[PDB]
Amino acid sequence: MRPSLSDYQHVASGKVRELYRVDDEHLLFVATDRISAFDFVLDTPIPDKGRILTAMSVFFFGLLTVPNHLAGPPDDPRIPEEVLGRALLVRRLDMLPVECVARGYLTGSGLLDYQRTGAVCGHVLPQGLGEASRLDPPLFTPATKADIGEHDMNVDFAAVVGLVGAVRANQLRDETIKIYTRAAAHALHKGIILADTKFEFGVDIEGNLVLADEVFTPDSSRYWDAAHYQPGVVQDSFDKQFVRNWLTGPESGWDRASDTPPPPLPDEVAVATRERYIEAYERISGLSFSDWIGP
Ligand SMILES: CCn1cc(-c2ncnc(N)c2C#N)cn1
């Protein structure tokens, strides 16, 4: 018999993910069906989003050869029925206070930093780059969490050294670029560009570096349709563009310029978005989401 979620201690709330203590050495990492757009957690959940993103993370953990925090199978008996398929039993780590970001393409705050300074996170780049320009080699563009509402702050390699040590910073940089490169090539082979990605790592009892959190989800990574990749313009979000377009379209009644919370989504937009998540998962993994476990 699976335990109730109420049997575990809630330790951390993200906007979209939850974390619970299972015992002294294990956590329960829970994805919800909540979706964020324009830095708002929207009223309307995307059905099965938590399950699909959990399935995606599990796929990529298996694709990569590096140590990760998974501590049991997706149907581990310690996982409550209520969160089955969207929760993982993981090893408790000492988390390193660095957002480990790799960028294979120049967009978002990376592009903005470049347009302001000619550099991103200490990397002085060629002149003449622009929106969605390919970056070769991919860049390690680390960041640190800021206050509750604020975006992460981009920092350079020296900042990472000061946070975790010189040898460890080297290790973070190398592993971040290595696993990003591997996953990005895999996805592109299936017609999806992983434009960038954000990792969190922790350290286990033996001092080993361990990949944690979620990996290569469309929340942790910019997913693009490769078939429509066009450097020089903003690429559509593979998963979130229907949501973005509706929210900023004539039917929402919402003004994004106002920092007022957005209205709920049409059911059909939520269902369409769910479909996009399933398509991305199935294309990348070569698996069927209908086989993924659930309540
Ligand atoms: C919800 C984001 N978050 C994850 C942790 C964490 N902490 C300790 N050990 C771990 N494996 C993890 C993970 N994943 C702390 N915040």
Short mmCIF file of C-alpha atoms and ligand atoms in Angstrom, two decimals:
data_model
loop_
_atom_site.label_atom_id
_atom_site.label_comp_id
_atom_site.label_asym_id
_atom_site.label_seq_id
_atom_site.Cartn_x
_atom_site.Cartn_y
_atom_site.Cartn_z
CA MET A 1 0.00 0.00 0.00
CA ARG A 2 1.35 3.39 -1.06
CA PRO A 3 1.66 6.04 1.67
CA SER A 4 -0.38 9.22 1.65
CA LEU A 5 1.37 12.43 0.70
CA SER A 6 0.29 13.67 4.15
CA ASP A 7 2.64 11.07 5.66
CA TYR A 8 5.59 13.13 4.42
CA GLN A 9 6.88 16.51 5.56
CA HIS A 10 6.60 19.34 3.06
CA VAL A 11 9.99 21.04 2.92
CA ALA A 12 9.94 23.31 -0.11
CA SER A 13 7.52 24.95 -2.47
CA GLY A 14 8.47 26.12 -5.91
CA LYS A 15 5.89 27.74 -8.16
CA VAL A 16 5.50 24.49 -10.08
CA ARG A 17 7.35 21.83 -8.10
CA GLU A 18 7.04 20.54 -4.57
CA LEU A 19 9.48 18.74 -2.34
CA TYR A 20 8.84 16.42 0.59
CA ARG A 21 11.01 14.65 3.14
CA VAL A 22 10.69 10.87 2.94
CA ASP A 23 13.41 10.04 5.43
CA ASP A 24 16.80 11.41 6.52
CA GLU A 25 18.37 10.52 3.18
CA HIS A 26 15.50 10.71 0.70
CA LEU A 27 13.10 13.25 -0.76
CA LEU A 28 9.98 13.10 -2.90
CA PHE A 29 10.29 15.41 -5.90
CA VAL A 30 6.82 16.29 -7.20
CA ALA A 31 5.89 17.97 -10.47
CA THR A 32 2.50 19.68 -10.56
CA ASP A 33 0.27 20.48 -13.53
CA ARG A 34 0.84 24.21 -13.01
CA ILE A 35 2.26 26.23 -15.91
CA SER A 36 4.14 29.52 -15.83
CA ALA A 37 4.04 32.15 -18.56
CA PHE A 38 5.30 35.75 -18.42
CA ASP A 39 6.55 35.03 -14.88
CA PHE A 40 3.04 34.25 -13.68
CA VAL A 41 1.85 30.89 -12.48
CA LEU A 42 -1.38 30.62 -14.44
CA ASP A 43 -4.78 29.81 -12.94
CA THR A 44 -5.36 26.97 -15.33
CA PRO A 45 -3.44 23.70 -14.93
CA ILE A 46 -2.30 21.74 -17.96
CA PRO A 47 -3.67 18.22 -17.60
CA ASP A 48 -0.94 15.57 -17.21
CA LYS A 49 1.83 18.18 -17.48
CA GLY A 50 3.45 16.99 -14.26
CA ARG A 51 3.43 13.37 -15.46
CA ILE A 52 4.75 14.24 -18.90
CA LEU A 53 7.60 16.36 -17.58
CA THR A 54 8.47 13.69 -15.03
CA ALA A 55 8.54 11.12 -17.86
CA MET A 56 10.82 13.45 -19.84
CA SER A 57 13.23 13.98 -16.96
CA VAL A 58 13.41 10.21 -16.35
CA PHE A 59 14.13 9.64 -20.03
CA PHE A 60 16.99 12.13 -20.09
CA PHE A 61 18.46 10.87 -16.79
CA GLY A 62 18.65 7.46 -18.46
CA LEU A 63 20.14 8.89 -21.65
CA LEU A 64 22.95 10.60 -19.74
CA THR A 65 25.69 8.51 -18.12
CA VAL A 66 26.31 10.89 -15.21
CA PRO A 67 25.39 10.27 -11.56
CA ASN A 68 21.91 11.57 -10.72
CA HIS A 69 19.72 11.86 -7.69
CA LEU A 70 17.15 9.21 -8.64
CA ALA A 71 16.81 6.73 -5.78
CA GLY A 72 14.12 4.40 -7.07
CA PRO A 73 11.90 3.50 -10.02
CA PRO A 74 8.93 5.65 -11.13
CA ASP A 75 6.57 3.18 -9.42
CA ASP A 76 8.57 2.99 -6.16
CA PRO A 77 6.15 2.00 -3.35
CA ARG A 78 7.16 5.10 -1.40
CA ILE A 79 5.41 7.27 -3.97
CA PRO A 80 1.82 8.19 -3.04
CA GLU A 81 -0.98 7.17 -5.41
CA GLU A 82 -2.04 10.80 -5.67
CA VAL A 83 1.25 11.80 -7.32
CA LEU A 84 2.04 8.57 -9.15
CA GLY A 85 3.78 9.34 -12.42
CA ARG A 86 4.62 12.92 -11.45
CA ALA A 87 6.83 12.24 -8.44
CA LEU A 88 10.25 10.69 -7.96
CA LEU A 89 12.03 9.23 -4.99
CA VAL A 90 15.41 10.96 -4.87
CA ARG A 91 18.58 10.99 -2.77
CA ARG A 92 18.96 14.00 -0.50
CA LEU A 93 22.02 15.97 -1.58
CA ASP A 94 23.86 19.04 -0.39
CA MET A 95 22.78 21.34 -3.21
CA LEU A 96 25.30 23.67 -4.81
CA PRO A 97 24.03 27.29 -4.97
CA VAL A 98 24.59 27.71 -8.71
CA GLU A 99 22.14 27.60 -11.56
CA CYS A 100 24.18 25.72 -14.16
CA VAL A 101 22.95 27.00 -17.51
CA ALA A 102 24.17 25.97 -20.95
CA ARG A 103 23.22 27.98 -24.03
CA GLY A 104 23.56 26.60 -27.52
CA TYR A 105 21.69 29.60 -28.93
CA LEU A 106 21.58 33.26 -28.01
CA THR A 107 18.24 34.40 -26.60
CA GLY A 108 16.64 35.69 -23.42
CA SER A 109 18.91 37.23 -20.85
CA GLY A 110 21.95 35.87 -22.67
CA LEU A 111 21.08 37.85 -25.76
CA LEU A 112 20.19 40.90 -23.66
CA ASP A 113 23.52 40.81 -21.79
CA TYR A 114 25.29 40.49 -25.15
CA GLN A 115 23.40 43.41 -26.65
CA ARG A 116 24.26 45.52 -23.63
CA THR A 117 27.92 44.60 -23.13
CA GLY A 118 29.14 42.34 -25.93
CA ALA A 119 29.56 39.61 -23.36
CA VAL A 120 27.52 37.00 -21.53
CA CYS A 121 28.57 35.67 -18.12
CA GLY A 122 32.19 36.56 -18.78
CA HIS A 123 32.23 35.28 -22.36
CA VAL A 124 33.20 37.95 -24.86
CA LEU A 125 31.39 36.91 -28.03
CA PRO A 126 31.90 37.62 -31.74
CA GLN A 127 30.35 40.80 -33.09
CA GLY A 128 27.23 40.48 -35.23
CA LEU A 129 25.20 37.92 -33.30
CA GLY A 130 21.49 38.29 -32.71
CA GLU A 131 18.25 36.65 -31.68
CA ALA A 132 18.48 32.85 -31.81
CA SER A 133 22.01 32.91 -33.20
CA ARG A 134 23.76 29.57 -32.83
CA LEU A 135 26.53 29.57 -30.23
CA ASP A 136 29.40 27.22 -31.03
CA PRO A 137 30.72 26.00 -28.73
CA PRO A 138 27.77 26.16 -26.33
CA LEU A 139 28.28 28.60 -23.44
CA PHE A 140 28.34 27.94 -19.73
CA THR A 141 26.27 30.88 -18.48
CA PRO A 142 25.82 30.36 -14.75
CA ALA A 143 23.29 32.24 -12.66
CA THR A 144 22.33 32.70 -9.01
CA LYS A 145 18.86 32.86 -7.50
CA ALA A 146 17.72 36.33 -6.46
CA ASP A 147 14.80 37.44 -4.28
CA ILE A 148 11.35 35.78 -4.35
CA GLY A 149 9.93 37.54 -7.40
CA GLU A 150 13.13 38.48 -9.21
CA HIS A 151 14.76 36.63 -12.10
CA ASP A 152 18.05 34.77 -11.57
CA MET A 153 21.18 36.92 -11.81
CA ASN A 154 23.72 36.06 -14.50
CA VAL A 155 27.25 35.64 -13.15
CA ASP A 156 30.68 34.79 -14.53
CA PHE A 157 32.99 31.87 -13.87
CA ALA A 158 34.87 33.70 -11.08
CA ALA A 159 31.55 34.11 -9.29
CA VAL A 160 31.02 30.35 -9.52
CA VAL A 161 34.52 29.73 -8.19
CA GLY A 162 33.68 31.92 -5.20
CA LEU A 163 30.51 29.94 -4.58
CA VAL A 164 31.73 26.35 -4.80
CA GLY A 165 35.54 26.23 -5.13
CA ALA A 166 37.90 26.42 -8.10
CA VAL A 167 38.10 22.70 -8.90
CA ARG A 168 34.35 22.24 -8.36
CA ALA A 169 33.55 25.20 -10.61
CA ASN A 170 35.64 23.62 -13.37
CA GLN A 171 33.71 20.40 -12.87
CA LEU A 172 30.34 22.14 -13.02
CA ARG A 173 31.30 23.93 -16.23
CA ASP A 174 32.61 20.80 -17.92
CA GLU A 175 29.73 18.54 -16.97
CA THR A 176 27.12 21.19 -17.83
CA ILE A 177 28.47 21.67 -21.35
CA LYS A 178 29.06 17.92 -21.85
CA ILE A 179 25.56 16.78 -20.93
CA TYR A 180 23.91 19.72 -22.67
CA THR A 181 25.81 18.90 -25.88
CA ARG A 182 24.75 15.25 -25.70
CA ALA A 183 21.08 15.93 -25.02
CA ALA A 184 20.89 18.75 -27.57
CA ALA A 185 22.25 16.57 -30.34
CA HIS A 186 19.81 13.80 -29.40
CA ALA A 187 16.82 16.12 -29.48
CA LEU A 188 17.85 17.81 -32.73
CA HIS A 189 18.18 14.40 -34.36
CA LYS A 190 14.45 14.00 -33.52
CA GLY A 191 13.55 17.47 -34.82
CA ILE A 192 13.60 19.42 -31.57
CA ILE A 193 16.15 22.09 -30.64
CA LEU A 194 17.06 22.38 -26.99
CA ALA A 195 18.17 26.00 -27.18
CA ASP A 196 19.42 26.16 -23.64
CA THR A 197 18.95 24.37 -20.32
CA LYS A 198 19.32 24.90 -16.57
CA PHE A 199 20.76 22.26 -14.22
CA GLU A 200 21.04 22.10 -10.48
CA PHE A 201 23.68 19.84 -8.97
CA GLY A 202 24.26 18.60 -5.48
CA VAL A 203 26.99 16.73 -3.65
CA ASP A 204 26.48 13.37 -1.94
CA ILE A 205 28.11 12.01 1.21
CA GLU A 206 31.24 10.93 -0.69
CA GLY A 207 31.79 14.34 -2.29
CA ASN A 208 30.52 13.16 -5.67
CA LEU A 209 28.84 15.61 -8.01
CA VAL A 210 25.26 14.52 -8.68
CA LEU A 211 22.78 15.89 -11.22
CA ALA A 212 19.49 16.71 -9.51
CA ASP A 213 16.23 18.58 -9.94
CA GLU A 214 14.58 18.07 -13.30
CA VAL A 215 16.54 17.75 -16.48
CA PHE A 216 15.71 18.91 -19.98
CA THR A 217 12.07 19.63 -19.41
CA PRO A 218 10.40 22.42 -21.38
CA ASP A 219 10.32 24.31 -18.08
CA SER A 220 14.10 23.94 -17.50
CA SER A 221 14.93 24.31 -21.20
CA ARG A 222 13.82 26.25 -24.26
CA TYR A 223 12.28 23.72 -26.66
CA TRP A 224 12.11 24.83 -30.31
CA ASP A 225 10.74 23.14 -33.42
CA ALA A 226 13.87 22.49 -35.52
CA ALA A 227 11.81 22.43 -38.70
CA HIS A 228 11.07 26.13 -38.26
CA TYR A 229 14.36 27.31 -36.88
CA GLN A 230 15.09 30.72 -38.36
CA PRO A 231 17.98 32.69 -36.87
CA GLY A 232 17.22 36.38 -36.48
CA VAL A 233 13.67 36.17 -35.13
CA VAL A 234 12.18 34.99 -31.85
CA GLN A 235 11.50 31.24 -31.98
CA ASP A 236 8.13 29.93 -30.90
CA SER A 237 8.05 28.05 -27.62
CA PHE A 238 7.38 24.45 -28.64
CA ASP A 239 5.20 23.91 -25.58
CA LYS A 240 3.99 27.36 -24.50
CA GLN A 241 3.30 29.33 -27.66
CA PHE A 242 -0.45 28.61 -27.73
CA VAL A 243 -0.70 29.91 -24.17
CA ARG A 244 1.43 32.98 -24.90
CA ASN A 245 -0.49 33.81 -28.07
CA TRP A 246 -3.88 33.52 -26.42
CA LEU A 247 -2.86 35.52 -23.37
CA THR A 248 -1.52 38.35 -25.55
CA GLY A 249 -4.25 38.05 -28.18
CA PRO A 250 -7.56 39.93 -28.51
CA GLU A 251 -9.66 37.29 -26.70
CA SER A 252 -8.00 37.25 -23.26
CA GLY A 253 -8.89 40.78 -22.21
CA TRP A 254 -5.48 40.90 -20.54
CA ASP A 255 -2.74 43.50 -20.90
CA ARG A 256 0.70 41.97 -20.31
CA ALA A 257 2.23 45.42 -19.80
CA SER A 258 0.17 45.61 -16.64
CA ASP A 259 1.84 43.46 -14.00
CA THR A 260 -1.62 42.23 -13.04
CA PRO A 261 -2.16 38.45 -12.88
CA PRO A 262 -3.41 36.93 -16.16
CA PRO A 263 -6.91 35.39 -16.61
CA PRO A 264 -7.58 31.64 -16.83
CA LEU A 265 -6.91 29.85 -20.11
CA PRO A 266 -9.50 28.38 -22.45
CA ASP A 267 -9.86 24.65 -21.83
CA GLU A 268 -9.02 24.08 -25.50
CA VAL A 269 -5.72 25.96 -25.12
CA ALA A 270 -4.85 23.82 -22.09
CA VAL A 271 -5.69 20.61 -23.96
CA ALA A 272 -3.67 21.79 -27.00
CA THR A 273 -0.73 22.52 -24.73
CA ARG A 274 -0.97 19.05 -23.18
CA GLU A 275 -0.81 17.66 -26.71
CA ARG A 276 2.38 19.62 -27.38
CA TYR A 277 4.02 18.19 -24.26
CA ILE A 278 3.10 14.65 -25.30
CA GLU A 279 4.43 15.25 -28.81
CA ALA A 280 7.75 16.57 -27.51
CA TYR A 281 8.13 13.70 -25.07
CA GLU A 282 7.24 11.04 -27.62
CA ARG A 283 9.46 12.48 -30.34
CA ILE A 284 12.49 12.77 -28.06
CA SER A 285 12.10 9.55 -26.07
CA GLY A 286 10.77 7.23 -28.77
CA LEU A 287 8.33 6.04 -26.11
CA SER A 288 4.56 6.31 -25.86
CA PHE A 289 3.18 8.50 -23.10
CA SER A 290 0.21 6.12 -22.88
CA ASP A 291 2.64 3.66 -21.26
CA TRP A 292 3.71 6.12 -18.56
CA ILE A 293 2.45 5.31 -15.07
CA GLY A 294 -0.34 7.27 -13.39
CA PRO A 295 -3.08 7.06 -10.75
C1 LIG B 1 12.43 21.93 -5.74
C2 LIG B 1 13.96 22.27 -6.04
N1 LIG B 1 14.83 21.72 -5.00
C3 LIG B 1 15.40 20.50 -5.04
C4 LIG B 1 16.15 20.35 -3.90
C5 LIG B 1 16.98 19.13 -3.47
N2 LIG B 1 17.57 19.13 -2.28
C6 LIG B 1 18.26 18.13 -1.84
N3 LIG B 1 18.44 17.04 -2.56
C7 LIG B 1 17.88 16.94 -3.76
N4 LIG B 1 18.06 15.73 -4.52
C8 LIG B 1 17.12 17.98 -4.27
C9 LIG B 1 16.50 17.85 -5.61
N5 LIG B 1 16.02 17.75 -6.64
C10 LIG B 1 15.99 21.54 -3.15
N6 LIG B 1 15.19 22.37 -3.86
#
